[PDB]
Amino acid sequence: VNSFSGYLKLTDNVYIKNADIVEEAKKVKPTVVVNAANVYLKHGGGVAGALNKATNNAMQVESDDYIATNGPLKVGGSCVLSGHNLAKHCLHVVGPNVNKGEDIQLLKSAYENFNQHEVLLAPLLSAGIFGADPIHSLRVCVDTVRTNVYLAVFDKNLYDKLVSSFL
Ligand SMILES: C[C@H]1CN(C(=O)c2cccc3[nH]c(=O)oc23)C[C@@H]1C(=O)O
Numbered sequence: 315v316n317s318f319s320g321y322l323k324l325t326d327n328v329y330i331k332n333a334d335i336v337e338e339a340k341k342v343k344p345t346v347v348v349n350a351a352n353v354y355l356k357h358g359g360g361v362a363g364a365l366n367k368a369t370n371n372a373m374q375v376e377s378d379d380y381i382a383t384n385g386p387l388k389v390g391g392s393c394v395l396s397g398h399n400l401a402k403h404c405l406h407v408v409g410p411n412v413n414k415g416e417d418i419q420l421l422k423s424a425y426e427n428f429n430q431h432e433v434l435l436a437p438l439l440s441a442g443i444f445g446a447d448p449i450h451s452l453r454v455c456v457d458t459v460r461t462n463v464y465l466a467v468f469d470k471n472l473y474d475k476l477v478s479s480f481l
Pocket residue numbers: 334335336359360361362364365437438441442443466467468469
């Protein structure tokens with residue numbers, strides 16, 4: 315039993331809710347919240363900008379130190395950093411950004427990072443300003459993640475479409 319509430323069950327291990335991931339993190343304090351990161355951990359907009367804003371920019375400060383030490387992430391890769399006031403940990407995962415011309419096949423590699431964590435609160439990777447089709451992202455999620463994932467979808471219209479079209 316866990317504290318996630320109001321989710322629709324899509325499969326044995328994947329759940330979905332129309333929710334603001336920031337507000338959901340603030341209420342649940344999950345062990346892991348996933349950020350929709352880029353390779354530079356520059357949290358300017360989309361999910362990343364919202365999560366970082368909710369930490370009063372502490373996520374960005376920590377991220378800048380991480381990059382100064384380690385260099386950029388790989389597209390499809392991840393790193394574990396603090397969850398600040400939102401979660402125990404933040405798993406920063408880089409899905410391909412279609413608006414940068416990155417290979418969409420890397421979306422499966424990106425979701426594989428979730429399997430290193432038993433339970434996660436997450437957004438759909440590569441959705442939103444990353445330019446991928448969220449229906450496809452949901453399909454890859456379901457077909458790749460084996461651990462327990464609670465997906466927060468900000469847009470109610472998109473949420474309804476994702477549910478109604480789910481196979
Ligand atoms: C397509 C993504 C983009 N996105 C946000 O940008 C966002 C998330 C939480 C709070 C916020 N306040 C704000 O102004 O923007 C946000 C959440 C969407 C999703 O994952 O469904």
